[PDB]
């Protein structure tokens, strides 16, 4: 068929609407990789003025050696059953990659094994070598080969119903206990980085600094493809809520007092309900005091958790999350997750991807916590076909790919 020149926006549109599109094939994602030494090139193929496949190629020089790697991260973006388009994309990639002294062309498209028979067959026939069906988070390939995904093309009740039972209960508590979820801005990243520092120290992880998050956010946020969410506990707002509850409780008492005075038969019940409401009033007043104490410490509230949410068309991604060691009983992360899923659905996404996992690892393994966390959120395990290399220089490939 034919090689085509399409604009950045045209490429991104095609990626966003293709079933095999992905965040890692967007032009603004390539912008984020400049900081770590990657440079980009694009290819497109089609017929009769209609694009049938695209790919964004990232190149990076191999330390100490006169070669590059060509990495098509989550490409090619093509129907892997379209042999003509697939071959044409390989033809174009080989031209560019040889000119860049690449030792191989590495691809890792988001195609589930379930649906990957054609892909495996057709890639094999074209000369690609497979890295194998190893653990979901094997160090033998760059991306996770398994992820955990929540279907979000659901109403609020259906979405909540999809979570595991204990977690549903925690989400309902989170919605009630008194935090708010904010869609933040670039200035919010300073709060986020602080939370991430705390999270790194609590878990065992090395944490990246604010500049690292700014690099991702600034490329994609303009297009609505990156958003930052922050969860706040605001004492003033909650004090207002308590004042309203106190007014409502006094009005309940008024109503039962009026039944007591007019209805002999209901008097014992009325006094009972009055006693209950009086107890609630006393407790609410105690809470008001505690919230006032908090307000003195944190006049404009305190942020408890935060996360970055990315998009590529109908795919949304929970990329990074962080939370502090304080006020954990408000369940801020649970409030955050459900809010972000709803936001993602409203933006046009139908899946919400929590990222990588092993498939049901044992408790002693380094990745167990990821499985324990992600499995309760109405997720299914997405097992991908994996990583494939079209090798251009055999001796170099053997040396490097260790």
Swiss-Prot record:
Q: What GO molecular function terms would the record report?
A: aminoacyltransferase activity
EC number(s) on file: 2.3.2.16
Q: Report whether Transferase shows up as a keyword of the record.
A: yes
The GO annotation for biological process reads:
cell wall organization; peptidoglycan biosynthetic process; regulation of cell shape
Question: What top-level branch of life does the organism fall under?
Answer: Bacteria
Q: Which family does it belong to?
A: Belongs to the FemABX family.
Under what name is this protein listed?
A: Lipid II:glycine glycyltransferase
Q: Which organism is it from?
A: Staphylococcus aureus
What's the encoding gene here?
Answer: femX
């Amino acid at each position: 068929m034919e090689k085509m020149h399409i604009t950045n926006q045209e490429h991104d549109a095609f990626v966003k609407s293709h079933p095999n599109g992905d965040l890692l094939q967007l032009t603004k994602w390539a912008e984020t990789k400049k900081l770590t030494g990657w440079y980009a090139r694009r290819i497109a193929v089609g017929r009769d003025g209609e694009v049938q496949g695209v790919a964004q190629l990232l190149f990076k020089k191999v330390p100490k050696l006169p070669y590059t790697l060509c990495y098509i991260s989550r490409g090619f973006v093509v129907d892997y059953s379209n042999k003509e388009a697939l071959n044409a994309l390989l033809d174009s990639a080989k031209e560019i990659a040889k000119a860049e002294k690449a030792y191989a062309i590495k691809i890792d498209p988001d195609v589930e094994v379930d649906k990957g028979t054609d892909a495996l067959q057709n890639l094999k026939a074209l000369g690609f070598k497979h890295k194998g069906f190893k653990e979901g988070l094997s160090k033998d390939y760059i991306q996770p080969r398994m992820t955990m995904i929540t279907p979000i093309d659901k109403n609020d009740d259906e979405l909540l119903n999809s979570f595991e039972r204990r977690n549903r209960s925690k989400v309902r508590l989170a919605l009630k206990r008194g935090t708010t979820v904010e869609r933040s801005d670039r200035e919010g990243l300073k709060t986020f980085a602080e939370l991430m520092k705390i999270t790194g120290e609590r878990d065992g992880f090395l944490t990246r600094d604010i500049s690292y998050f700014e690099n991702i956010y600034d490329a994609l946020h303009e297009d609505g493809d990156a958003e930052l969410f922050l969860v706040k506990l605001d004492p003033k707002e909650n004090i207002a809520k308590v004042n309203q509850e106190l007014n409502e409780l006094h009005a309940e008492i008024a109503k039962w007092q009026q039944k007591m005075e007019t209805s002999e038969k209901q008097a014992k019940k009325a006094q009972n309900m009055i006693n209950d409401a009086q107890n609630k009033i006393a407790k609410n007043e105690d809470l008001k005091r505690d919230l006032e104490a908090l307000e003195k410490e944190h006049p404009e509230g305190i942020y408890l958790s935060g996360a970055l949410l990315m998009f590529a068309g109908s795919k949304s991604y929970y990329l990074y999350g962080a939370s502090s060691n304080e006020f954990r009983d408000f369940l801020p992360n649970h409030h955050m997750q459900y809010t972000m899923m709803k936001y993602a659905r409203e933006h046009g996404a139908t899946t919400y991807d929590f990222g990588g996992t092993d498939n049901d690892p044992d408790k002693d393994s380094e990745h167990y916590g990821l499985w324990a966390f992600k499995k309760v959120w109405g997720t299914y395990l997405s097992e991908k076909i994996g990583e494939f290399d079209y090798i251009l220089n055999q001796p170099l490939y053997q040396l490097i790919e260790q």
